[PDB]
């Protein structure tokens, strides 16, 4: 009973069983500061049964540094009481409660216990109980630019899925007597040693089809081994194999036992000596707090740092830790003890919330057991960071001033950022900017653009939007929400509903871009990313890119004149199947789903568009007769949808649907089997219908069958929608109408001058005149996956399953059909939080204006396996032009609006190069091989005039520059690459 209208994207990551187990689990959260509130928000969005909060500490001003559910009117009130009311709104299926006191025996009510802002003695007391009663325990801590996570799920934790990947499946070609399984031609199984597989449809070895898993011994990318199958047979042909994923048992140690001998998870392999340092440092922090009435070391205080280092020495000696303590790093941990950054809180909250979901669902591999992280490369170096600048000012930014200082706060307050997109990452980024105080100064400003509107499925991970906001623009709602979070942003945010692309260069022009400080992408497609990257490269602005997919995510930074751009690298492209495979010989459900989508377009979209265009354009027929690749098809569509097969009631729609069923599931298969009988052979004597080709069988219409009736209903309903008729859903009318149907006879056809044009003319003049039909239009069907009442996904599912039944393929359900046909991207709130945290950790590096390339980090992570990795950005390539060092990416030529002849002469005299090709946009302005007359005509014109003439379109008034690509040859004739040209109009 999972509400798929809300958890649509999350079910594609977790699944139905996982979320069913989640909906029966209770989570207790101790601590309601930024980290705790982040964890609680992610858990509430995920969909656990309930959340309980425990934090009786009265609110303080500094707590607003990362707590976005606290306002300045809540000072002096316990944090939990003022946070519960705002947390209760995120999800209506997840109650949120508050407990004024905790007793140990009270912990047995909860499936998971999360602990933050708690001393080590209390953590030991809680864990000593939770461990022996088999309750998952997570403890998180965030001190300045340092963070720690600890997980303990019990001694006998059972993990059903360890990586979150779909089971591997493949098509076999032959299995020898010794178990050597071979894949089809140029096909990779993708298995690893120790996996288990089960076979089906294996001919010659029926014993393998029982369904018993067998060990896999990989012997190459195309073959593997399963053991000895001597008894089961001599050789097997064809068949399919599917991977079997077996449960694993993970055994955790208690906190008391794991303090002495910890097990580390390394977020970065470049610094593998640090986590042992942080292990001592955090315990020393706890001891120091215990020795000073729970007070942490003061910011940038040397006396407190010395005392903290003495505590660290004592702890290291006590635990017999044979590690040499790095004094600088430990004292850095001491200095930033009171720091409270929203970016670190978001990062650790995403990680910890994912761990909570792992504990409650027994899915994915959990952290085992200590995860120590630092982002110490984000510490500013262009400002003064001392005890005087880092002391609190009694403002909401104390938690951040304790790390960065007041001068860096002034630098942050005067940023002018530009955020593209307002989805999940956009909302997280806006929240982080509001908490950090970005653009709250006199010269600060934020601009956010997004052309989409809020939908029900977006509320699962876009926490700034509520159900009352459905149907409104994302940017306005996000700006209002963040202005509520931080009132100082009132009047500092501007929201646009414009798509960023070539058509919006009049709004986001030179003036708009010249004032920015950085651009942050929150998009979901590669075309927009490339466009924004090109614009940033031209204007030389820093860019922050980030992306997510299920539990995976990445973040990249582009810095002018330092690193390469976003488009300098290539990603794997989308997979498109051969047209022959889709048309005639499918063997996967994806092929049939693609075929069904094409059928939907061809039945309910293209003919309607042709009919409408015929009744609007006065010269449509003549243009079509020589423009389209099949004018006969257009004429037939117009005739059929206007006169021949125009329905007058719903009964005719039902009859049409029955006829289409016959056409697409019974007759084309008969024709195909007439052309290639099931006993036919190839040119080499092999059987034709073998391997990837499956012999089909015609379907006979049976009303009682569920799939046939579903197809009839969906097709009739969509046809009625096209013609605007009143559809129905009662089976009585369908069964009554389809009873009196006489199928027209069909016999496959064996086949065996200029009169065709005369026939086309006769058909064309037979159509009713456009004048006779004025104000009459047919409504086309525009594909929409998120609506479960327009019959689109129903029709596609029914057609796909019927075609699978034709070729004996395993049918899918509406869930998988919607996933495949809709191109849905799995999404999670935890991954969004993690990527936003990383992006905001890079933003402070950008604000400081760091020059070295080793100080920046591109980040990648997969939360399903607990993998984090970072790497320096790639430096932009250099080149030699005329004996000068040129940056291939960030350098350009700046020239006036001169003539083409003058441009060529300038390039000859100055760079010593001969211009061979000159192009602008998608036009060829000049080429060395053009005829002399054309050049002599085009030489004395200015570049703007030449572009206008060639493109046959005047330049817009707002256009202030032209970008030209030039290919030139040296004196010797060797081609030399040069940067682009920027002509100033």
């Amino acid at each position: 009973t999972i509400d798929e209208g809300l958890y649509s994207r999350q079910l594609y990551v977790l699944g139905h069983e996982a979320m069913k187990q989640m909906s029966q689990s209770n989570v207790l959260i101790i601590g309601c500061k930024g980290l705790g509130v982040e964890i609680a928000k992610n858990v509430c969005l995920a969909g656990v049964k309930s959340v309980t909060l425990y934090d009786p500490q009265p609110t303080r001003i500094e707590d607003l540094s990362s707590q976005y559910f606290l306002t300045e009117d809540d000072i002096g009130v316990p944090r939990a009481k003022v946070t519960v009311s705002k947390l209760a709104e995120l999800n209506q299926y997840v109650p949120v409660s508050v407990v004024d006191e905790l007793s140990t025996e009270y912990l047995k009510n909860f499936k998971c216990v999360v602990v933050t802002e708690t001393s080590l003695t209390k953590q030991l007391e809680i864990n000593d109980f939770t461990h022996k009663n088999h309750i998952a325990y997570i403890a998180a801590d965030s001190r300045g630019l340092f963070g720690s996570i600890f997980c303990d799920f019990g001694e006998n934790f059972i993990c059903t899925d360890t990586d979150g990947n779909e089971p591997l499946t493949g098509m076999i070609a032959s299995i020898t007597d010794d178990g050597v399984v071979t894949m089809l031609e140029e096909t990779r199984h993708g298995l690893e040693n120790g996996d288990f597989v089960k076979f089906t449809e294996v001919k010659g070895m029926p014993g393998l089809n029982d369904g018993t898993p067998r060990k896999v011994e990989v012997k190459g990318p195309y073959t593997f081994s399963i053991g000895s199958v001597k008894d089961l047979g001599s050789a097997g042909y064809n068949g399919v194999f599917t991977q079997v994923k077996v449960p694993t048992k993970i055994s955790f140690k208690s906190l008391r036992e794991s303090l002495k001998d910890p097990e580390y998870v390394y977020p970065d392999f470049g610094k593998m000596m640090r986590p042992p340092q942080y292990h001592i440092a955090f315990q020393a922090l706890s001891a120091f707090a215990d020795a000073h009435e729970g007070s942490l070391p003061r910011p940038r205080n040397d006396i407190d740092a010395a005392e903290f280092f003495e505590f660290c020495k004592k702890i290291a000696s006590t635990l017999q830790f044979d590690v040499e303590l790095d004094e600088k790093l430990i004292k850095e941990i001491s200095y930033q003890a009171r720091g409270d950054l929203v970016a670190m809180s978001a990062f650790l909250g995403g990680a910890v919330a994912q761990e909570v979901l792992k504990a409650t669902t027994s899915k994915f591999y959990p952290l085992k057991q200590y995860f120590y992280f630092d982002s110490l490369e984000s510490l500013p170096s262009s400002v003064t960071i001392s005890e005087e600048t880092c002391k609190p000012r009694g403002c909401r930014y104390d938690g951040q001033i304790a790390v960065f200082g007041s001068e860096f706060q002034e630098k942050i307050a005067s940023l002018s950022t530009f955020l593209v997109g307002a989805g999940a990452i956009g909302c997280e980024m806006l929240k982080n900017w509001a908490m950090m105080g970005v653009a709250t100064g006199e010269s600060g400003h934020i601009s956010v653009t997004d052309m989409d509107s809020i939908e029900k499925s977006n509320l699962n991970r876009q926490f700034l939007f509520r159900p009352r906001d459905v149907g409104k623009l994302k940017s306005e709602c996000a700006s209002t929400a963040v202005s509520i979070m931080n009132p100082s942003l009132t009047g500092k945010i501007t929201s646009y509903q414009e798509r960023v692309g070539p058509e919006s260069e009049g709004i986001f022009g030179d003036e708009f871009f010249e004032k920015l400080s950085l651009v942050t992408n929150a998009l979901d497609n590669v075309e927009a990313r490339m466009y924004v990257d090109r614009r940033c490269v031209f204007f030389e602005k820093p860019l922050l890119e980030s992306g997510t997919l299920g539990t995976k995510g990445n973040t990249q930074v582009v810095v002018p004149h330092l690193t390469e751009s976003y488009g300098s690298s290539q990603d794997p492209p989308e997979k498109s199947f051969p047209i022959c495979t889709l048309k005639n010989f499918p063997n996967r459900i994806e092929h049939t789903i693609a075929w069904a989508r094409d059928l939907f377009e061809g039945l309910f979209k293209q003919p309607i568009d042709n009919v409408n265009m015929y009744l609007s354009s006065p010269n449509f027929l003549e243009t079509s007769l020589k423009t389209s690749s099949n004018p006969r098809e257009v004429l037939e569509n117009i005739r059929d949808y206007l006169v021949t097969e125009k329905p007058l009631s719903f009964e005719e729609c039902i009859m049409w649907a029955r006829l289409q069923f016959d056409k697409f599931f019974n007759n084309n298969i008969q024709q195909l089997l007439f052309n290639f009988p099931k006993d036919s052979v190839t040119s080499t004597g092999q059987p034709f219908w073998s391997g990837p080709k499956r012999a089909p069988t015609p379907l006979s219409f049976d009303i009682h069958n569920r799939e046939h009736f579903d197809f009839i209903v969906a097709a009739a309903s969509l046809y009625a929608f096209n013609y605007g008729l009143k559809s129905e859903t009662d089976p009585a009318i369908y069964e009554r109408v389809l009873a009196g149907y006489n199928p027209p006879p069909f016999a496959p056809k064996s086949g065996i001058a200029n009169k065709d044009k005369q026939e086309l003319k006769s058909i064309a003049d037979s159509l009713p005149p456009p004048s006779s039909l004025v104000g009459f239009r047919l409504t086309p069907a525009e594909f929409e996956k998120d609506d479960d009442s327009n019959h689109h996904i129903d029709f596609i599912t029914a057609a796909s399953n019927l075609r699978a039944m034709n070729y004996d393929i395993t049918p899918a359900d509406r869930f998988k059909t919607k996933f495949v046909a809709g191109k849905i991207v799995p999404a999670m709130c935890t991954s969004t939080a993690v990527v936003s945290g990383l992006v905001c950790l890079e933003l402070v590096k950008l604000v400081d204006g760091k020059k070295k390339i080793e100080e920046y980090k591109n980040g990648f992570f997969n939360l399903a396996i607990g993998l984090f990795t970072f790497s320096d950005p790639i430096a932009s390539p250099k080149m030699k032009v005329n004996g000068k060092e040129i940056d291939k990416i960030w350098d350009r030529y700046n020239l006036p609006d001169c003539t083409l002849q003058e441009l060529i002469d300038y390039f000859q005299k100055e760079e010593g190069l001969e211009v061979t090709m000159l192009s602008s946009g998608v036009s060829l302005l000049y080429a060395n091989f053009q005829p002399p007359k054309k050049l002599a005509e085009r030489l004395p014109l200015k570049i703007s005039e030449l572009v206008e003439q060639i493109t046959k379109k005047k330049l817009e008034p707002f256009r202030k520059h032209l970008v030209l690509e030039i290919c030139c040859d040296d004196a010797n004739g060797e081609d030399v690459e040069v940067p682009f040209i920027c002509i100033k109009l």
Binding site: P221, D268, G270, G547, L549, D571, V825, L867, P873
Partner: protein
């Protein structure tokens, strides 16, 4: 020399290489074992992204070293 490559999806790959091999040879071996074109591979060792034209000894990649094979993602 034998090295290990871990993918962002959890898969593990074992490569037999030599310290004098270029990054191009390693990428070709990874393509053979995985089918990923060398121009679409992102290899990370000890916080450095490996670039074509250099050798393993330039990155101090020794036996039993672990590289990460990563890729960018389009959602968000």
């Amino acid at each position: 020399m034998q090295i290990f490559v871990k993918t962002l999806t959890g898969k593990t790959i074992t490569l037999e290489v030599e310290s004098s091999d270029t990054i191009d040879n390693v990428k070709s071996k990874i393509q053979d074992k995985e089918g990923i074109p060398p121009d679409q591979q992102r290899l990370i060792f000890a916080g450095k992204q490996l670039e074509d034209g250099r050798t393993l000894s330039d990155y101090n990649i020794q036996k039993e070293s672990t590289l990460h094979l990563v890729l960018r993602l389009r959602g968000g």
